[PDB]
Amino acid sequence: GNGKYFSKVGSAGLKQLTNKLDINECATVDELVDEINKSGTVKRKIKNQSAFDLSRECLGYPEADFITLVNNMRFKIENCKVVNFNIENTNCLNNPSIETIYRNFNQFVSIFNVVTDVKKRLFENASGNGSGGGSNRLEEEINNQLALQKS
């Protein structure tokens, strides 16, 4: 029997995704992709859903209010993934709902990190990140880091 039903970051995003995708459990994004790779419907849906959206859904935060949180935050984007973050304008935290969302925002980014990697793994590139350039502020900063990368 497997124990330790507690994980923060990384495998936590996997655990939330595997739960959401109704797939097998996964210890790494690499193994996660492989399971999804077996689940054709999930695989295709991961590209059909946007990383931001797919990840946000996994937590169950209200789209608008969740977006409201990240627009007022900033993020350390390491390798196209939010590795760290902090709130820039605590205006959104006026709502205890968003407080709840914020205090557990890392969960989202954990899941986001996963879908951000998985969507790259399954698809060499896809229009399923969030919106043009980026979802909402968060991915814009990511795209911003990518803009620094003059090809």
Curated annotation (Swiss-Prot):
Top-level taxon in the UniProt lineage: Viruses
Family, per entry: Belongs to the orthopoxvirus OPG148 family.
Record function comment: Plays an essential role in viral DNA replication by acting as the polymerase processivity factor together with protein OPG116. Serves as a bridge which links the DNA polymerase OPG071 and the uracil DNA glycosylase.
Subunit record text: Interacts with the DNA polymerase catalytic subunit OPG071. Interacts with UDG/OPG116. Component of the uracil-DNA glycosylase(UDG)-OPG148-polymerase complex; OPG148 and UDG form a heterodimeric processivity factor that associates with OPG071 to form the processive polymerase holoenzyme. Interacts with OPG117.
Protein name: DNA polymerase processivity factor component OPG148
Biological source species: Vaccinia virus (strain Copenhagen)
Lineage, uppermost ranks: Viruses, Varidnaviria, Bamfordvirae, Nucleocytoviricota, Pokkesviricetes
Designated gene of the protein: OPG148
First and last residues shown, out of full length: 304 to 426 of 426
